[PDB]
Amino acid sequence: GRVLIIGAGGVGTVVAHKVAQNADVFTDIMIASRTKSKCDDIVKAIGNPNIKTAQVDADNVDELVALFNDFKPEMVINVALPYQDLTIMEACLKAEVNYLDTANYEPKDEAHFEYSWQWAYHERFKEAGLTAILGCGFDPGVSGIYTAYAAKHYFDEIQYLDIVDCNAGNNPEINIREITQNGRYYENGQWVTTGPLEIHKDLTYPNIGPRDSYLLYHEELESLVKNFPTIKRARFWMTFGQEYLTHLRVIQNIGMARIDEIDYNGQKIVPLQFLKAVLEGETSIGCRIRGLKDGKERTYYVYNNCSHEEAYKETGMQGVSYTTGVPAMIGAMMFFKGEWKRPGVNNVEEFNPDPFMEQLNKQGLPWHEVFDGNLEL
Amino acid sequence: MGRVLIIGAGGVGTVVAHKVAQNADVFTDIMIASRTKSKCDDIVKAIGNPNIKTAQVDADNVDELVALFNDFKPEMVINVALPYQDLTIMEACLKAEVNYLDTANYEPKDEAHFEYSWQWAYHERFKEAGLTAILGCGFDPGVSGIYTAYAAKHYFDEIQYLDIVDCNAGNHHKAFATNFNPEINIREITQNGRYYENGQWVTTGPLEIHKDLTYPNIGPRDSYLLYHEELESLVKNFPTIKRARFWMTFGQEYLTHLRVIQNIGMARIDEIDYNGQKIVPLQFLKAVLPNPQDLGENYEGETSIGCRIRGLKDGKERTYYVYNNCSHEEAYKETGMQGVSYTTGVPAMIGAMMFFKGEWKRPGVNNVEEFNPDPFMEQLNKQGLPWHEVFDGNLEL
Ligand SMILES: NC(=O)c1ccc[n+]([C@@H]2O[C@H](COP(=O)([O-])OP(=O)(O)OC[C@H]3O[C@@H](n4cnc5c(N)ncnc54)[C@H](OP(=O)(O)O)[C@@H]3O)[C@@H](O)[C@H]2O)c1
Ligand SMILES: NC(=O)c1ccc[n+]([C@@H]2O[C@H](COP(=O)([O-])OP(=O)(O)OC[C@H]3O[C@@H](n4cnc5c(N)ncnc54)[C@H](OP(=O)(O)O)[C@@H]3O)[C@@H](O)[C@H]2O)c1
């Protein structure tokens, strides 16, 4: 049960905490990242001196292979940035290490992500007997596990999938890249494109109430549509307050959302990253699913609500880092326990959702089901 | 001597170079020196006069400036670099016995507070050396004080109320851009408002007080009260003034962008460590924002800047409104810049002309209202900034 965490950010902080909380499964833990001091901060916060740390540039396959051959992990949990997905997978192949991440690949010079890059590794991973688990955060991640759970127990055919993500509380480089692209959803065999944050409507969230929700593309639509060909329409919605949208608009207008490197006193700075250097309540994230069971239409809503305060008291991080870090740990737990072992490259919906859902209820993300309700869309 | 040296090759310096080159009878030898020499050479190529010399200089370095001054031997140095360079350039002018003019008074790099004490401190040294320093000779500061001196000289026994009003009614068709150096521009407009009334200076919140004011050829515009450096010297030099305020128009989209820039920390003036390098966020913002110097091509509309003055003549209250409207497109066609660079650059050239012609000769450190306004006002009509007068109208203020 040797696990290596790459990335000492908000998510990695949560993953480390949750891995440490399950030492019967995770007997040996290391945290490696670009800035080692953040790794050591996490170890001190957890209070477990047995967690090892290391500096590594995960853009460098050779550095990674040396680290992997030193610590000898059985799985690496990549919660660095999407840019590191492929170099880490390369190192995993060469050092015969299994793999898990929470976000699929996008190149540094283009804010477009898709699964082709990582799916390309399927046969190499398979012939090496290695398992890769892609997109095992909350969304992507629990959102596809929720959908697999519904398909397994409640639906003959899933026909409409609507993922809803509300942060009702009170990494910006990858975050602002995600939300500024054209919207995109799936309907009747085709991918449909909107303007950025053009389509929106009020959706009512448990314990929160109605919130302005905006349609945008999201990674998991690509694989969920592929893996559930009964789907007639799949969309993803996220809430955005007016002040947030205003700040987002201005940031773009002034040039601080740029993703190319600019030259500033002999140093290569990308405006969006420099912005990062300067930049109560709860989340509610789930899936609203409609389809057929025993010849009749049926609706289903399954969700988690995560309190920012409770997440902070446990891990020092807020609800967005918490909801992503917990499932990443559980994915590794499923592999270590043999519940999720499938040589090749896998999306979460391809595994048995039941043992994962059972752990979510025990590891800080209890989920709730509403049957036969009005899904509002 | 007739030799003039221009420091700063930005938007204002581009205009100043064009305007001095247009008056070769006065300015017989011209040099443009600036931190980045290629921009000096860009200006000379645009003007088409190979006789204009260029040079690289770091105007933060008194030694470098003195060497440049003793080589070129200017009679006056027109400082249109940043306020930060005001004192080092004045130091060098004193050491090399060269006269001085700028369009903005000093603020330290580490504090967004400007005032005249720094430069007034050089008065007796300049005076003893026979050197004249002309401070704040742009449009506002500059023409705004020359307008005031003009009104005091010709139309009032006693001026009592001064309101300077500044509207940029143009459209540069950018989501957001500033009209001059964004670093200096943003530092200025984000401070607390201040004005003068009944013997005291009153502080307001930033952009707290605003009125609808009607601008010639433009109409009503949302106008905001803020401090402006010429209020300090004009209140000093015209004691009869009872109330002095400065107003500038801001559109809603502009204010929205300005608010967000401050909230996200990109208006900060302190240095942060970014990959072992010291970076001032406001200075980084300048790098990505549109360059004011490149806006003229798609700039339409015009500016309107003037002074609304009220006071007594022969015991009766009178009003006076004097202003200039400047077409962004005409400024662009003439100089490649836009109306804010133009309104600032033309009066800087004229102040130097007044010195070269002997009209404005006053050893020491001077604000523009201390000179005879008449010959300056005459040149404004001839050098591209004609002004208009309205007598006894409603000042709305
Ligand atoms: N599926 C979901 O629900 C979900 C939700 C949110 C986020 N995520 C994903 O989670 C990941 C982490 O997010 P976060 O918020 O924790 O980000 P973060 O706070 O910026 O942390 C990223 C970490 O990766 C490190 N890193 C970056 N480049 C590296 C390199 N070349 N070599 C080694 N380490 C490197 C960073 O090092 P430094 O300390 O030097 O900066 C930092 O410690 C991202 O991929 C994000 O897309 C997924
Ligand atoms: N009175 C008024 O009505 C009024 C109105 C607007 C502006 N102004 C003033 O006019 C001045 C010029 O503004 P602008 O918009 O033209 O600014 P700008 O476009 O940024 O140009 C300033 C110039 O100074 C140069 N410079 C900066 N630091 C220097 C240093 N250490 N040594 C030498 N040169 C240096 C810059 O060089 P680089 O090319 O290397 O950047 C640039 O060429 C400012 O002081 C501003 O406050 C006055």
Residue numbers in the entry:
A (entry chain B): 2 to 171, 181 to 289, 300 to 397
B (entry chain A): 1 to 397
The paper states:
The polyamine biosynthetic pathway used by most gut microbes differs from that used by human cells. This alternative pathway employs carboxyspermidine dehydrogenase (CASDH), an enzyme with limited characterization. Carboxyspermidine dehydrogenase, from two major gut microbes, performs the reductive condensation of aspartate semi-aldehyde (ASA) and putrescine using NADPH as a coenzyme, in the formation of carboxyspermidine. In this study, we investigated the largely uncharacterized carboxyspermidine dehydrogenase that produces carboxyspermidine as a precursor to the polyamine spermidine in an alternative polyamine biosynthetic pathway first identified in Vibrio alginolyticus. This alternate pathway is known to be present in many bacterial species including a majority of the most prevalent human gut microbes.
BfCASDH is composed of three domains. A dimerization domain interrupts the catalytic domain from residue 251 to 289 and is composed of two α helices and two β strands that form a small antiparallel sheet. The descriptions below refer to chain B but include the slight differences observed in chain A. The hydrogen bonding network surrounding the C2′-phosphate of the 5′-phosphate adenosine-2′,5′-bisphosphate moiety suggests a basis for NADP selectivity for BfCASDH. NADP+ is positioned in a V-shaped active site with two entrance channels, one through the NAD(P)-binding domain and the other through the catalytic domain and flanked by α 9 of the dimerization domain. The proximity of the dimerization domain, and our observation of cooperative enzyme kinetics, suggests communication with structural elements of the catalytic domain that overlay the active site and across the dimeric interface.
